[PDB]
Amino acid sequence: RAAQFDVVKHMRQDQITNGMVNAISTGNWSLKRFKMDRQGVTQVLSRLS
């Protein structure tokens, strides 16, 4: 388009929330920056007593 656009029409919301929420729940923190793939970094709190 010749008329100028605004980035306001492309402020995505899901990617951050997904990228965080799933990262905590599944317990893997894959990161391309360091080529780091860490596992078992989260656990379910044990409510035996």
Partner 1 sequence: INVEIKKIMKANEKVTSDADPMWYLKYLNIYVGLPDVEESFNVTRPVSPHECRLRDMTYSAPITVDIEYTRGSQRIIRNALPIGRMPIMLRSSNCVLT
Partner 2 sequence: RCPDCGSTELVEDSHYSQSQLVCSDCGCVVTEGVLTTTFSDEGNLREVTYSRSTGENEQVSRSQQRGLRRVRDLCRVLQLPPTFEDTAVAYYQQAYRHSGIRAARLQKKEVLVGCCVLITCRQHNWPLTMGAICTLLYADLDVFSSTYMQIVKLLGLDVPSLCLAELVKTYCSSFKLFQASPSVPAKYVEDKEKMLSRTMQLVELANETWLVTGRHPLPVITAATFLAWQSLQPADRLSCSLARFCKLANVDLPYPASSRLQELLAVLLRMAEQLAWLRVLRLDKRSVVKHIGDLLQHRQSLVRSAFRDLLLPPCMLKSPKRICPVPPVSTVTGDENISDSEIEQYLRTPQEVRDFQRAQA
Binding partner at 1 among partner 2, partner 1, none, C-beta below 5 to 8 Å by kind: partner 2
38 φ, ψ (degrees, to nearest 5): -105, 140
Q: CB of 34: closest distance to partner 2 in angstroms?
A: 27
Residue 24 binds which of partner 1, partner 2, none (CB < 5-8 A, kind-dependent)? partner 1
Q: Phi and psi dihedrals of 47, rounded to 5?
A: -100, 40
**Residue 26: closest CA among 15, 16, 39, 36:** 39
Residues at the site binding partner 1, with contacts judged by CB under 8 A? 4-8, 11, 13, 15-17, 20-21, 24
